[PDB]
Design a protein around this ligand. Sequence first.
Ligand SMILES: Nc1c(F)cc(S(=O)(=O)Nc2nnc(S(N)(=O)=O)s2)cc1Cl
Ligand SMILES: Nc1c(F)cc(S(=O)(=O)Nc2nnc(S(N)(=O)=O)s2)cc1Cl
Ligand SMILES: [Zn+2]
Length: 258
Amino acid sequence: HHWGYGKHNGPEHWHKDFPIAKGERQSPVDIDTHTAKYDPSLKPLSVSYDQATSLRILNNGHAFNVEFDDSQDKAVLKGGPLDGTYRLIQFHFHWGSLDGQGSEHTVDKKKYAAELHLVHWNTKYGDFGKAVQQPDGLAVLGIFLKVGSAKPGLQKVVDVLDSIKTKGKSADFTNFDPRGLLPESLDYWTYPGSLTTPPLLECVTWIVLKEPISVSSEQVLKFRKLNFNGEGEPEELMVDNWRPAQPLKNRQIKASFK
Ligand SMILES: Nc1c(F)cc(S(=O)(=O)Nc2nnc(S(N)(=O)=O)s2)cc1Cl
Ligand SMILES: Nc1c(F)cc(S(=O)(=O)Nc2nnc(S(N)(=O)=O)s2)cc1Cl
Ligand SMILES: [Zn+2]
């Protein structure tokens, strides 16, 4: 039936309905830190989220998305390998059933407990819909989450999760500041890729931060209490909603740091 992360509709099945699954620039990929090359042509990365307007949080049966108002440039990503301005539309996470797995991208094969994706679209293309029809339509800022100390800026998300336990549920989630989810350093790796979930469109410039943010065991645990299924259907814990590393093929990963 519908794609998912189960044994019969998981990552290894997606190619049947979404051929691009075996394309040339699929994500995520393993980040070989030694093979990644520092790039001088990379302009300073700019993350301007002070005017961010969060609107709501929703369970789409695959993960939960915190959406933002992107009708105006309020939260934009610029600089780095990007040409132009990209507006934040939503962010979500990917996590595992255990602390030892969960991230989509990996660093020297190392898997983190989870991974944060802040999705942005290129303003030159008018809307998100048109942006996903362009090779450079999107820019996703990926941040790894390791288990350790609690991340203050993530608790507001964690505490609202009970109100959107099942697929289809959503709740007002205004005045949330995404800056509270950013690590100290902005050092990153970047490469051309795709969405990590169907339709797996290859319209993404990936920017993955090197420094992980640390979250508490209890914060991650609450992520695992969510449900893939709908309210009246049998319970299936929302865990391991990540796609494994895909072939890098003809691509190079650039580092913004030497
Ligand atoms: N417009 C547009 C786009 F959004 C994406 C891709 S693509 O990602 O390179 N190729 C695929 N086109 N459809 C695909 S799917 N979901 O496998 O059927 S992905 C090509 C074009 Cl031309
Ligand atoms: N066409 C199209 C698209 F390319 C993407 C999304 S989306 O759900 O908002 N975006 C996400 N889908 N995958 C994500 S990931 N894990 O960041 O690569 S972002 C929805 C539609 Cl309808
Ligand atoms: Zn994602």
